[PDB]
Design a binder for this molecule. Structure first.
Ligand SMILES: Nc1ncnc2c1ncn2[C@@H]1O[C@H](COP(=O)(O)OP(=O)(O)O)[C@@H](O)[C@H]1O
Ligand code: BEF
Ligand SMILES: [Mg+2]
Ligand SMILES: [Zn+2]
Ligand SMILES: [Zn+2]
Lengths: 333, 363, 337, 369, 248
């Protein structure tokens, strides 16, 4: 079975088509781009009828025999699309897919979208019978190491001349989804049709991407800027950001910070920096985060964090924003 | 034939007339006089702890209210309506368990029902029990029918605790706080029942059973059934003592005298022995609390000795003489907080060990 | 597992608890109080088998009949079980509602109408109050059963309808002998298992056959480095296995044994780690030790009660607070109110 | 305001209300869509039922002095009261301003009224063709073309019937998946060429109201509005736009295999094969040999059905799968005992005409079984 | 499994059973709080089979002779059991071997076997429900009443379809109002020998009673503007109906 990457699919589509297509991944930008690229390829090859189905646990046999009846002989050529459940194929569809694999014709072009599946799901017989006939596309979101390179290439296909500072800020503001990178790139291109992405131009927008959760709220505390993170929290409460998510971010990050604080007395800093495999761009702030905030500060911060999470959990919610900004104002000392 | 002619005492000896109810004269008198004088309110809210009689008083009130022989404070008990309401097969007394019928569908059903005529009795009465857990929507829909109902509609509310009622719901109904039954009342009712059912007993076990059940006659009868299930169908001091696992004052005073002198090793050995015999730890703590109370009384005025038993009162007198009031107060407070935290303790024995070892703190 | 497992020391209790039903005087309800894995489940199962069996043999169930043949297939039309679904943890009003609405109909096979609640503490209080009427006044030939680790946490009303039968854990020597016959290792481990589990032999079996024992060993070793160095934080990895209640309980048991060692007591629970006990006594001050033990118990309670609480944050704060307390000059808390 | 007066016999009032019930009620999105419009014109009462795309007008003849005026009344309640009353009792109807008083025998009723909420021009046609199609013509045409047309289909235009008037004849066509229907009715009038698409629901409404095979009908067909005057009553519907496939491009596909013989025998054989036809892939196999047909079916139940039929044939040995339901509708709407069948290929459309006359023709694209 | 012995055994014509069920079926409770209501009471005494159904606002009693000496027995069959009993028996075959045991009912109809479990409990007596001193009487043709009430029910309220009866010497009158502030009123010519009375019924139960009564002439008995009505065949006493009126 041909496993491909989203950029390399087009060439394959030009060379020859496959009756069955699979789109596995979490990032939906490349999912939809690959889907409609294949669809326009089929339309360029005379495929007219395009059926899509949303397969859920509610979807069942009586939701699939119409599908089977569809692709026998109606007119010219047609295409089919499916939506898979969040956990991948189940036992209910394990037989439906086996039945669907029994009838493959050039009349119908089969398209399947979804996320990553368990290794026992492709181990099923229908997948093995579909190996030579189908092509799978990898559609996960890779790490941030290749993020600047990929976004620079993308902006080149979007005809945008980014600066190094513009690239840095756009990457740093949107490490969540290629949808965010897109919408930012098209917003910038439409605002400035020229294509030169100067840092003063790209910084304006509305704010640093969105009110986000982590980036500047945590970073200012890492460097100790009370005003910055405090205004960020004010904006977060203005837009009604979920306090539980903020607490989860603090829980996942301050624990790593505490791990970093230990061993610093009897081990050089950089050894601790690379022992945890923490990102170097993050290490550049972890340095002064450890230097400024002492062990007593860490203990007090974790204590108030536990008190806050407690009071929040049993449906009290006693001014969660006040205690969050209290955490911030402790971490700024 | 095999249909279990036997019925549990907790239900067989349910009150059947206003003269069969143990205690709560403060509400029986009011109810009977209201029945007789011609003042009957359209919503009655009986509230009280478990096993004190809210359901029974409400059912007797229903029996009286729609008896065919007028509306009397004394239901005849031989007619039809009395018989069905006693059996619970009467159409116009409808039992609604508010835990179930809390969705808006059921409340709308009830409000639809209240608009019609009765079937057999003068009054169609909804006995809603555990009302304190109707969803807010249910209560807000029920306000109108609880405030100004038709002529033949009366409501009887039974709640385990008034606190959870929306206060506006409290205000529209007539509150009856059923007092917890005193130990004397419980023991006398138990004596009357057990003599009636030709069951051998002795007053001591009755006092133990009354003490164990904190003012709940149904609880008293439950413990009676437990005490007659074990011990060849009779009530005896040894039987109830084993059933409760209670301990004599000697052992608890050994604990308090070892702990007041900081004899930690002796205290832990006593706890080990008590666990070996397998006592109930809450019982140990209540006995320690009682002994400390008696010691405090003796300290205050020498007249109030330990004379209920007066077996080892020498030790109590000596301990009172040799310990300042402050230390006894600290011991009582420590043991009491520990008692409060038995359920939260990972184990009962270890919770008592925590409490005692913490009492060992003073020097 | 399959029909669970009978336990040898349970035979007396059942006999007593069947006599009350042989005479016909059996209280319809029953609130069996027994420790987890103690064996109350087998007792309830055997009782229900005797009750719904059309021909009740003397102290046995049938020997041969369809009435409990449908019981063995687990498909009797009267026998109802109330357990939370495998994917959930709280017993909803809906299941008790269905069972109680289907109780008002007659007995299908002409026998009794037996109900069973698998675990009463899991009953939502709304479900308890929906089941209150059914327990207080059931129809003829209707019986009930319930199982609780402790009765005091139950609703004030539900236990008041029921008889609070108790399952005494077997004598210490007998339990040790049974566990030795079942599991083979040093008696110190067995005594630790029984005393930790408050005497539940089934819970000792679960500790051994479960991985936790080795993990327990891990904790000991970790403390063997922590207390001599005042470095408790490194305990985090030991105390986070979705078993924070149980592991915190083991830690509190160790601290209890140390405080016992101060006021030198003949018997302590942890007998497999006497050196650890001595070290814990040596390094830690009694007031600090009691404050730390109180915090350990408090955190275990906070984790056990509120689901959805973050285990990592709680245990991290606990370890930081302990490290703070080991510093001289700190004011320790005292239980109050 | 203007006030209205009626003394209308029940029986002569029911049929108009009962007929106009089509574009009435049926989940009325507005307080005005679920109501009927009454108006007085000279000596007639017009009842208008509207659903924003189909307008059905019924003309009740008036025989008594009746006050002029118009109103809007809840259609369902009016129908129920007019139906439940005793037979033959004249109903006295009056407009009490905001209310609608109606009395009959010993019974009185009042209705809520809407003054003016559905009174625009409501219609505007083009009328390229105005053939006076008589009753019996479109009767058989529509019963032979409706079949089971597009439901949920993305191709909107395939929903409505295609009318094409040319010379003296009107050809009506309908495409739905495999199945296709056409009837060439010889109107006989010198008529201009015209092509139009009518909504399927409008078609079923026209056929249902049609009835009564005696009166010539006036059909005015434009590009956005179609009107049909079925004797007393009037119906109007919108018109679906183009993009419809040409029947001149889907009917003539150079057939080369020819067959004939009984239609009801094929009906019985098709019904008996449908028992053991593939329940997931509706359709059975047809073996075609010289002067012989064989029908075979193999359902997932592992039950094999086989039948032999004497159908004339002088072509080559063939094996064609087909949907049983589509061809069974073809046979049932052909209203004939013998049919002709032209085969082209196993993946090329199969024609089926009436052996009685060329007036009725059909197409089913074969199945791959 | 060993079958349960029956304490009530009889055999019925399909017509008799169908008439009984059609007479009382619309008169039994759905999911009602009173558990013993959601079903049908099948009383038997002498040679007469009687059927009782109630929902707290309605009562259908239907009595038919059988000719077979039968013991005095009572039994309740729940909603589902009787619904699928009526579905089960439809043909003209004589076998209706009905067996009533202590906990379940079985009716054998040729090759089909009926099975259900009885609602444990005792039904309220109907005689205590039917008024004992009806001092007002009315008479009218059944179809006239049924058509009249169906016509007047058109413009009533939706969920609860209340109607008002004004019964007097001059004529009978029924009126209906709805949340839409719509008025309906109509007159019937019944023979009355009394003064004016106003009562409030629900047209749904009245219409059901008239539809399933299936006779020619009907007689109403009444006592008070709040007490229960007793509608019956004016030509027979094999079926009686009661409709507890509505408050206004
Ligand atoms: N005041 C009382 N007099 C006599 N018996 C009582 C009284 N209160 C409770 N009981 C006993 O308790 C049992 C249950 O009483 P009940 O009235 O249901 O209490 P509740 O208020 O909690 O519903 C009764 O059957 C009766 O034996
Ligand atoms: F047990 Be009672 F109804 F509070
Ligand atoms: Mg109660
Ligand atoms: Zn009475
Ligand atoms: Zn058996």
């Amino acid at each position: 079975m041909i496993r491909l990457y989203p950029e390399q699919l087009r060439a394959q589509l030009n060379e020859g088509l496959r009756a069955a297509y699979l789109l596995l991944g979490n990032d939906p930008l490349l999912l939809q781009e690959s889907q409609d690229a294949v669809r326009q390829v089929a339309a360029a090859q005379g495929f007219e009828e395009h059926h899509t189905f949303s397969i859920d646990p509610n979807t069942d046999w009586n939701a699939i025999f119409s599908l089977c009846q569809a692709m026998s002989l109606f007119a010219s050529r047609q295409t089919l699309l499916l939506l898979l459940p969040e956990n991948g194929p189940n036992a209910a569809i394990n037989e439906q897919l086996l039945t669907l694999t029994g009838l493959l014709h050039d009349d119908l072009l089969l398209i399947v979208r979804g996320n990553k599946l368990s290794k026992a799901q492709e181990n099923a017989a229908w997948f093995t019978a579909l190996a030579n006939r189908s092509v799978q596309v990898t559609c996960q979101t890779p790490e941030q190491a290749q993020l600047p390179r990929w976004v620079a290439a993308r902006a080149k296909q979007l005809n945008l001349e980014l600066d190094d500072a513009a690239n840095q800020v756009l990457c740093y503001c949107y490490e969540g989804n290629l949808l965010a990178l897109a919408q930012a790139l098209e917003r910038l291109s439409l605002l400035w049709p020229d294509g030169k992405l100067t840092l003063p131009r790209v910084e304006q927008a509305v704010n640093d991407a969105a009110h986000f959760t982590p980036f500047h709220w945590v970073d200012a505390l890492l460097m100790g800027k009370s005003k910055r993170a405090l205004h960020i929290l004010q904006q977060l409460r203005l837009e009604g950001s979920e306090p539980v998510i903020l607490l989860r971010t603090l829980q996942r990050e301050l624990l790593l910070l505490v791990n970093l604080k230990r061993q610093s007395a009897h081990t050089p800093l950089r050894a601790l920096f690379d022992k945890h495999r923490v990102w170097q761009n993050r290490r550049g702030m972890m340095g002064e985060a450890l230097n400024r905030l002492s062990q007593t500060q860490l203990r007090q911060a974790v204590q108030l964090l536990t008190r806050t999470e407690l009071t929040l959990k049993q449906d009290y919610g006693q001014s969660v924003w006040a205690e969050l900004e209290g955490l911030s104002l402790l971490l700024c000392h | 034939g095999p249909h279990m002619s036997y019925q549990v005492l907790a239900r067989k000896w349910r009150p059947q007339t206003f003269a069969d109810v143990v205690g709560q004269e403060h509400v029986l008198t009011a109810l009977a006089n209201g029945l007789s004088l011609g003042r009957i309110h359209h919503a009655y809210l009986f509230s009280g702890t478990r096993g004190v009689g809210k359901t029974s008083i409400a059912r007797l009130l229903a029996k009286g209210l729609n008896c065919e022989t007028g509306i009397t404070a004394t239901p005849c008990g031989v007619c039809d309506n009395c018989r069905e309401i006693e059996q619970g097969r009467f159409v116009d007394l409808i039992e609604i368990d508010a835990a179930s019928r809390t969705k808006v569908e059921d409340t709308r059903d009830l409000l639809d029902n209240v608009q019609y005529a009765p079937a057999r009795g003068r009054f169609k009465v909804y006995l809603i029990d555990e009302v304190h857990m109707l969803s807010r929507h249910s209560f807000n829909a029920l306000l109108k029918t609880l405030e100004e109902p038709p002529e033949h509609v009366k409501f009887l509310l039974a709640t385990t605790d008034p606190q959870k009622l929306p206060v506006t719901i409290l205000s529209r109904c007539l509150q009856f706080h059923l007092k917890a039954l005193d130990v004397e009342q419980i023991r006398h009712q138990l004596e009357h029942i057990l003599n009636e059912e030709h069951i051998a007993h002795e007053p001591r076990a009755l006092q133990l059973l009354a003490r164990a059940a904190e003012g709940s006659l149904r609880d008293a009868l439950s413990l009676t059934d437990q005490a007659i299930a074990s011990g060849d169908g009779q009530v005896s001091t040894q039987a109830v003592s084993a059933m409760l696992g209670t301990l004599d004052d000697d052992q608890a005073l050994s604990l308090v005298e070892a702990m007041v002198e900081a004899n930690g090793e002796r205290v832990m050995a006593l706890i080990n022995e008590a666990a070996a015999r397998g006592i109930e730890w809450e019982a140990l703590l209540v006995e320690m609390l009682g002994l400390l109370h008696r010691i405090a009384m003796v300290q205050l005025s020498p007249a109030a000795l330990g004379n209920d038993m007066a077996a080892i009162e020498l030790r109590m007198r000596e301990l009172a003489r040799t310990i300042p009031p402050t230390d006894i107060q600290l011991y009582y407070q420590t043991l009491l907080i520990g008692r409060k935290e038995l359920p939260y303790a990972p184990d009962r024995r270890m919770g008592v060990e925590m409490t005692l070892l913490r009492a060992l703190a003073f020097h | 597992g399959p029909h669970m497992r009978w336990y040898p020391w349970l035979r007396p209790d059942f006999e007593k608890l069947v006599a009350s039903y042989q005479a016909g005087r059996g209280h319809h309800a029953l609130l069996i109080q027994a420790l987890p894995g103690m064996g109350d489940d087998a007792l309830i199962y055997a009782l229900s088998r005797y009750l719904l069996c059309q021909q009740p043999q003397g102290h046995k169930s049938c020997g041969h009949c369809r009435g409990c043949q449908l019981m063995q297939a687990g498909t009797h039309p009267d026998y109802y079980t109330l357990a939370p679904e495998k994917g959930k943890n709280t017993l909803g009003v809906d299941a008790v509602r269905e069972v109680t609405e289907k109780l008002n109909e007659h007995a299908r096979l002409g026998g009794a109408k037996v109900v069973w609640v698998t675990d009463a503490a899991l009953l939502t209080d709304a479900a308890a109050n929906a089941l209150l009427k059914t327990l207080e006044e059931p129809p003829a030939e209707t019986w009930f059963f319930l199982a609780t680790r402790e009765p005091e946490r139950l609703l004030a009303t539900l236990r008041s309808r029921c008889r609070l039968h108790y399952l005494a854990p077997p004598p210490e020597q007998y339990a040790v002998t049974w566990l030795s016959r079942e599991v083979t290792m040093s008696q110190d481990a067995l005594l630790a298992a029984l005393r930790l589990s408050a005497g539940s032999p089934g819970a000792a079996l679960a500790l051994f056959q479960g991985d936790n024992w080795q993990a327990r060993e891990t904790l000991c070793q970790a403390l063997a480095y922590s207390v001599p160095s005042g470095d408790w934080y490194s305990l985090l990895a030991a105390l986070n296995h979705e078993q924070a209640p149980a592991r915190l309980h083991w830690l509190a048991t160790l601290l209890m044994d140390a405080l016992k060692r101060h006021h030198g007591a003949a018997q302590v629970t942890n007998v497999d780690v006497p050196g650890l006990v001595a070290e814990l006594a040596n390094h830690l001050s009694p007031s600090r030790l009691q404050a730390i033990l109180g915090d350990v118990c408090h955190i275990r309670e906070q984790l056990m009660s509120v689901t959805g609480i973050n285990r990592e944050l709680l245990i991290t704060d606990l370890l930081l607070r302990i490290e703070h307390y080991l510093q001289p000059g700190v004011v320790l808390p005292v239980p109050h109110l | 305001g203007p006030h209205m007066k009626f003394t209308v016999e029940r029986e002569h009032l029911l049929k108009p209300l009962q007929q106009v019930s089509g574009p009435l009620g049926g989940r009325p999105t507005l307080p005005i869509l679920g109501n009927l419009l009454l108006q007085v014109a000279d000596g007639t009462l017009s009842l208008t039922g509207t659903d924003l795309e189909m307008e059905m007008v019924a003309r009740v003849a008036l025989v008594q002095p009746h006050e002029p005026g118009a109103t809007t009344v809840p259609a369902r309640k009016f129908f129920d009261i007019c139906r439940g009353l005793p037979e033959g009792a004249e109903i006295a109807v009056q407009l009490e301003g905001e209310r609608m008083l109606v009395r009959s025998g010993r019974s009185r009723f009042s209705l809520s009224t809407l003054p003016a909420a559905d009174f625009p021009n409501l219609d505007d046609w083009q009328s390229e063709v105005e053939f006076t199609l008589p009753q019996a013509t479109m009767k058989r045409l529509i019963e032979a073309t409706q079949f089971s047309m597009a439901h949920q289909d993305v191709r909107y235009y395939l929903n409505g019937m295609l009318f094409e008037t040319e010379g003296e004849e009107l050809r009506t066509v309908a495409t739905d998946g495999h199945r296709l229907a056409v009837c060439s009715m010889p109107i006989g009038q010198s008529l201009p060429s015209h092509s139009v698409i009518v909504p399927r629901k409008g078609v079923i409404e026209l056929m249902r109201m049609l009835d009564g095979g005696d009166n010539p009908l006036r059909v005015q067909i434009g590009s956005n509005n179609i009107r049909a005057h079925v004797g007393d009553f009037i119906f109007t519907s919108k018109l679906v736009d183009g993009r419809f496939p040409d029947y001149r491009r889907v009917l003539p596909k150079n057939p080369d295999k020819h067959l004939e013989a009984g239609c009801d025998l094929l009906k019985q054989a098709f019904a008996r094969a449908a028992i053991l036809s593939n329940e997931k892939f509706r359709g059975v196999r047809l073996y075609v040999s010289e002067n012989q047909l064989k029908i075979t079916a193999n359902n997932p139940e592992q039950e094999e059905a086989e039948e032999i039929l004497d159908v004339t044939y002088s072509g080559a040995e063939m094996e064609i799968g087909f949907n049983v339901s589509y061809v069974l509708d073809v046979l049932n709407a052909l209203k004939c005992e013998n049919v002709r069948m032209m085969l082209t290929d196993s993946v090329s459309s199969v024609q089926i005409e009436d052996a009685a006359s060329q007036s009725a023709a059909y197409v089913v694209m074969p199945m791959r079984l």
